[PDB]
């Protein structure tokens, strides 16, 4: 128990008599509040070290300080059976019963997955929202952040994806219902309502005996907002890959993440370099997102669904910045369809998609929405855009042609994008879609083929 | 499935805590078994081989006949009031790396929780 | 019933060597710590040596250190004491403690007499 | 019609739980007894690796 402080302020401490510590090492410590906290040796020094405590200092005298190298690397006990159990960012189960015995004690830092070991997926799922399963096509081993503004809901929409997440039985040409489907959760900062709101929709889901919850609250330390992410994903790696189950991971409150990221950003030595946020931010959002992917030789998968909550509707803001680039195919929510009462309020007009004829829309993914996706785009556009152009050109001025454009706007959006407690299968989507498309005569419907038209007449 | 899982854990706990009970009984009579001189030197060994210089060694005076070899190796032994551990205090300053049995018992589910369980259960 | 049978006693010259054996039955031999205790004629009980269930830990009295080796064969249910560099003060009935629940003497053999002369 | 469907289901979703509770409890006992006769063996394993 090494004594001798030099700097204490926040969850970053410095204490001397050290050089026996390694990068990424579990120590313990003593405080004047008569409690034993944690510490990750994030940085190491000549005769001191930088420690990162797993709790906020609210008391620490300089008479009583301690350091005890527990282990050289830093780890968490992880075992096969831990499904049905709830957890927190510390890593203690919050159930009330003795903590389970590991099989492996895997690092919490994370081991990256080989880009060679993956291969293009092609087995799609029902999200119970039409719009996704047509336009972007949410497949296993793929990310798809759901961008959410501040003053906008984030919770509401998320719940819809959790109780209506389900593989196709052979609508894609196969199922994966033959292997158990399960879900993983981990919240990074939640209040009083968001706590209970999530739990009561998991009883709707009927899953609370086959899910692993790593809930981090805001009454819980602020340092565990960036520990918990990595931590959670290692219990994904263990159960998808090495025990062959298709595990859905759902990460929310990646703005409360970013609060904690900022802290270390400037309070440590390192200087800001991403327009007032850190420059080692990249790595912090790489190590997180890049783990996930269907591996070729494994049956099972980690399907990650990021749910942002980013400050306002800026796009220069750090969060949507890096996140955009990282993910392949994206989904957005706005305030155009949230003034109309349409839950979810997905808007794909500014949104973008990069996988929809890239191993998806072809393959064991149906080709019957292949040309539909391409068509819906330029068709939905004709809509939204001219709603603006009308208020300049005239006040009600629209020509024979443009009249039709705007006619297909109000309609498509209402029917289609209001799902919520309503599930639509691959077939149910396309039928309805084509009947709103009959509002435009042939010549704007060039992109759909001769077959398609009649197909879903 | 949850009422099955929970009940197994409660029983499983009873077995883990019960091995600790048995191991702590051993510890109370550990100086009474004659392997006590072999235990104290290897714990005092690791304390000095590490970072400390061994400017002082602190064990009980009734563990002093069993660590008088190491009185003459490094420093002098003056009490933990345990009779179950050995502090050593470095010359790099305050330092202090303490190898106590209590700590290691306690950490025997904090670093080899797997080993014991496999032998218990499989 | 716990049954313990010492063998290998008798007469040794000073500086000589002897090996005591003790057979065990009536219990699961490998899960128990085992000891040797001796008694000189008309004198008290002196602890000689101890060995863990697995054989991984051994313990010796200061009077016998370097000269005596305790060992066990868990497939044969046999405990051994190898004794080298014998002297007249090692003349005793050697009892086999079989078996120490953790450290104490729960059961005793019938003893084997070693005479060093 | 709802009235006579509900009370059918309810009376099986108690019994089913009840039967599972008797297995649960007994399999709690079945993990105890396997360990408790290989208990001394564990304790030898703990002892050997706390003395360094």
- Other C-beta atoms within 10 Å of C3: how many? 13
φ/ψ of B2, rounded to 5, equals -65, -40
Q: At a CB cut-off of 8 Å and minimum separation 6, what does B40 contact?
A: B59, B63, B66, B67, B86
The kind and range of the H/E element at D42 are helix D40-47
Helix axes A370-384 and A386-393, enclosed angle (nearest 10): 20
Give burial (CB, 10 Å; 0-12/13-18/19+) of A192: exposed
CA distance C52 to chain B (A): 10
Helix (H, G, I), strand (E, B) or coil at A286: coil
CA distance D50 to chain C (A): 12
CA-CA-CA-CA torsion sign (C61, C65, C69, C74):
positive
Q: Which of C34, C51, C54 to mutate against chain D (most D CBs within 10 Å)?
A: C54
The owner of tokens 């025997």 is B108
Distance of alpha carbon A415 from alpha carbon A424, whole angstroms: 12
> Is residue D49 within 8 angstroms of chain C, CB to CB?
no
Q: Determination method here?
A: cryo-EM
For the structural domain made of A1-457, what CATH number should be given?
A: 3.40.50.12240
Q: Which chains touch D (3 or more CB pairs under 8 A)?
A: B, C
On whether the CB atoms of residues C86 and C10 are closer than 8 A, the answer is: no
Q: Which chain C residues are Cβ-neighbours of D44 within 8 angstroms?
A: 31, 52-54, 56
On whether the CB atoms of residues A333 and A148 are closer than 8 A, the answer is: yes
Q: At a CB cut-off of 8 Å and minimum separation 6, what does C49 contact?
A: B34, C35, C36, C58, C59, C60, C61, C64, C68, C70, C81
Residue in chain C closest to B30 (alpha carbons) equals: C103
Which of A305, A307, A86 lies closest to A202 in space, CA to CA? Answer: A86
Distance of alpha carbon A384 from alpha carbon A405, whole angstroms: 9
**With a CB-CB cutoff of 8 Å, which residues 58-117 of chain C face chain D?**
none
Q: Say how far residue A386 (Cα) sits from the centre of its chain.
A: 33
Looking at chain A, the residues that come just before a C–N gap of over 2.5 A are none
Q: Which chain A residues are Cβ-neighbours of B109 within 8 angstroms?
A: 101
φ/ψ of C75, rounded to 5, equals -80, -30
Q: Using alpha carbons only, how large is chain A's radius of gyration in Å?
A: 25
φ/ψ of A34, rounded to 5, equals 70, 55
Which of C57, C63, C2 lies closest to C27 in space, CA to CA? Answer: C2
On whether the CB atoms of residues A331 and A346 are closer than 8 A, the answer is: yes
φ/ψ of A24, rounded to 5, equals 85, 85
Which of A163, A117, A119 lies closest to A139 in space, CA to CA? Answer: A119
Which of A288, A421, A331 lies closest to A148 in space, CA to CA? Answer: A331
* Omega before A344 within 30 of 0, i.e. cis: yes
- Other C-beta atoms within 10 Å of A244: how many? 14
* Alpha-carbon distance values, A44 to A4, A20, A189, B50, B94 (Å): 16, 9, 29, 18, 19
Helix (H, G, I), strand (E, B) or coil at C41: coil
**DSSP structure class, residue C30:** G
Distance of alpha carbon B28 from alpha carbon D48, whole angstroms: 16
**DSSP structure class, residue A178:** T
Distance of alpha carbon A283 from alpha carbon A273, whole angstroms: 13
Q: Where are the domains of chain A?
A: 1-457
Distance of alpha carbon D47 from alpha carbon A401, whole angstroms: 87
φ/ψ of A402, rounded to 5, equals -60, -20
On whether the CB atoms of residues A11 and A262 are closer than 8 A, the answer is: no
Largest distance between two CA atoms of chain B: 62
Helix (H, G, I), strand (E, B) or coil at C55: coil
Which of C18, C5, C10 lies closest to C64 in space, CA to CA? Answer: C18
On whether the CB atoms of residues A241 and A106 are closer than 8 A, the answer is: no
Q: Using alpha carbons only, how large is chain C's radius of gyration in Å?
A: 13
The pair of structure tokens assigned to A80 is 């096969």
Q: What angle do CA A237, A239, A244 make, to 5 degrees?
A: 110
Q: Cβ contact (<8 Å) for D40 and C53?
A: yes
- Other C-beta atoms within 10 Å of A164: how many? 19
CA-CA-CA-CA torsion sign (B18, B20, B23, B25):
negative
The pair of structure tokens assigned to C76 is 């044969």
* Alpha-carbon distance values, A435 to A92, A131, A133, A366 (Å): 54, 16, 18, 20
For A40-74, b where at least 16 C-beta lie within 10 A, e where not — what string? Answer: bbbbbeeebbbbbbbbebeebeeeebbbbbbeeeb
The kind and range of the H/E element at A104 are strand A104-107
φ/ψ of B52, rounded to 5, equals -50, 150
What's the residue count for chain B?
122
Which of A165, A161, A149, A160 lies closest to A333 in space, CA to CA? Answer: A149
The pair of structure tokens assigned to B62 is 């009734």
Q: Cβ contact (<8 Å) for B10 and A97?
A: yes
CB pairs under 8 A between B and C: 28
φ/ψ of A349, rounded to 5, equals -70, -55
Helices (H), A146-210: 155-163, 193-199, 202-205
DSSP E strand stretches across A172-260: 181-187, 211-215, 246-252
- Looking at the DSSP bridge assignments, the partners of residue A184 are A212, A249
Give burial (CB, 10 Å; 0-12/13-18/19+) of A247: buried
What's the residue count for chain C?
117
The owner of tokens 């009892």 is C95
Q: Cβ contact (<8 Å) for D32 and B11?
A: yes
Helix (H, G, I), strand (E, B) or coil at A7: strand
Resolution in A: 8.7
Pairing of strands C112-116, C92-100: antiparallel
- Give helix then strand counts, H and E, for chain D: 3, 0
What's the residue count for chain A?
457
Which of B116, A372, A277, C106 lies closest to D35 in space, CA to CA? Answer: B116
């Amino acid at each position: 128990e090494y004594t001798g402080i030099t700097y204490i302020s926040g969850p970053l401490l410095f204490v001397e008599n050290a050089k026996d510590l390694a990068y990424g090492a579990i120590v313990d410590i003593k405080d004047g509040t008569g409690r034993v906290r944690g510490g990750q040796v994030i940085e190491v020094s000549e005769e001191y070290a930088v420690i990162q405590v797993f709790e906020e200092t609210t008391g620490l005298d300089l008479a009583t300080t301690s350091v005890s190298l527990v282990e050289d690397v830093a780890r968490l006990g992880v075992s096969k059976e831990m499904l049905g159990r709830r957890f927190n960012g510390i890593g203690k189960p919050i159930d009330g019963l003795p903590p389970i015995t590991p099989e492996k004690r895997l690092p919490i830092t994370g081991l990256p997955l080989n880009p060679v070991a993956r291969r293009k997926p092609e087995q799609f799922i029902q999200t119970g929202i039409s719009t996704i399963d047509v336009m972007n096509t949410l497949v296993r081993g793929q990310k798809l952040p759901i961008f959410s503004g501040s003053g906008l809901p984030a919770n509401e929409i998320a719940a819809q994806i959790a109780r209506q997440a389900t593989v196709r039985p052979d609508l894609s040409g196969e199922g994966e219902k033959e292997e158990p489907f399960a879900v993983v959760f981990a919240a990074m900062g939640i209040t009083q309502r968001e706590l209970s709101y999530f739990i009561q929709e998991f009883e709707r889901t009927g899953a609370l005996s086959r899910s692993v919850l790593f809930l981090n609250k805001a009454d819980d330390p602020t340092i565990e907002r960036i520990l918990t992410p990595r931590m959670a994903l290692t219990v994904a790696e263990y159960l998808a890959f090495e025990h062959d189950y298709h595990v859905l991971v759902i990460l929310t409150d990646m703005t409360n993440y970013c609060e904690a990221l900022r802290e270390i950003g400037a309070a440590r030595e390192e200087i800001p370099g991403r327009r007032g946020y850190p420059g080692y931010m990249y790595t912090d959002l790489a190590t997180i997102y890049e783990r996930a992917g269907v591996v070729e030789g494994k049956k099972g998968s980690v399907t990650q669904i990021p749910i942002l909550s980013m400050p306002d509707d800026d796009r220069t803001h750090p969060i949507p910045d890096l996140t955009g680039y990282i993910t392949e195919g994206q989904i957005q929510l706005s305030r155009e369809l949230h003034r109309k009462g349409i839950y979810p309020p997905i808007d794909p007009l500014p949104s973008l998609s990069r996988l929809m004829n890239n191993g998806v829309g072809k393959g064991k993914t149906r080709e019957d929405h292949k040309q539909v996706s391409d068509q819906l785009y330029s068709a939905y556009a004709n809509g939204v855009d001219i709603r603006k152009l009308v208020a300049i050109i005239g006040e009600d001025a629209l020509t024979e042609n443009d009249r039709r454009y705007l006619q297909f706007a109000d309609a498509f959006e209402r029917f289609f994008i209001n799902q919520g407690q309503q599930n639509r299968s691959i077939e149910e989507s396309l039928q309805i879609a084509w009947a709103l498309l009959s509002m435009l005569p042939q010549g704007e419907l060039k992109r759909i083929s001769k077959d398609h038209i009649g197909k879903y007449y | 499935e949850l009422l099955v899982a929970t009940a197994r854990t409660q029983a499983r706990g009873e077995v883990l805590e019960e091995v600790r009970r048995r191991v702590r009984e051993a510890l109370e009579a550990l100086p009474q078994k004659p392997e006590w001189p072999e235990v104290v030197r290897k714990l005092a060994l690791e304390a000095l081989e590490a970072l400390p210089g061994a400017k002082a060694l602190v064990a009980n005076p009734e563990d002093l006949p069993h660590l008088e070899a190491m009185a003459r190796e490094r420093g002098v032994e003056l009490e933990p009031a345990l009779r179950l551990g050995v502090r050593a205090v470095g010359a790099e300053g305050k330092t202090q790396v303490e190898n106590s049995l209590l700590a290691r018992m306690d950490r025997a589910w904090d670093a080899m929780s797997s080993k014991v369980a496999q032998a218990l259960w499989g | 019933e716990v049954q313990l049978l010492e063998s290998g006693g008798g007469l040794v010259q000073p500086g000589g060597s002897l090996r005591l054996s003790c057979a065990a039955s009536g219990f699961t031999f490998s899960t128990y710590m085992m000891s040797w205790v001796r008694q000189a004629p008309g004198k008290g009980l002196e602890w000689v040596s101890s060995i863990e269930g697995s054989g991984s830990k051994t313990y010796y009295a200061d009077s016998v250190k370097g000269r005596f080796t305790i060992s066990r064969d868990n497939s044969k249910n046999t405990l051994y004491l190898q004794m080298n560099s014998l002297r007249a003060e090692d003349t005793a009935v050697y009892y086999c403690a079989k078996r120490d629940s953790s450290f104490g003497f729960d059961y005793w053999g019938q003893g084997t007499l070693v005479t060093v002369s | 019609l709802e009235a006579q469907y509900r009370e059918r289901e309810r009376a099986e979703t108690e019994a089913l739980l009840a039967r599972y509770r008797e297995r649960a409890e007994a399999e709690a006992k079945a993990v105890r007894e396997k360990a408790m006769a290989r208990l001394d063996e564990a304790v030898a394993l703990v002892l050997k690796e706390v003395l360094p």
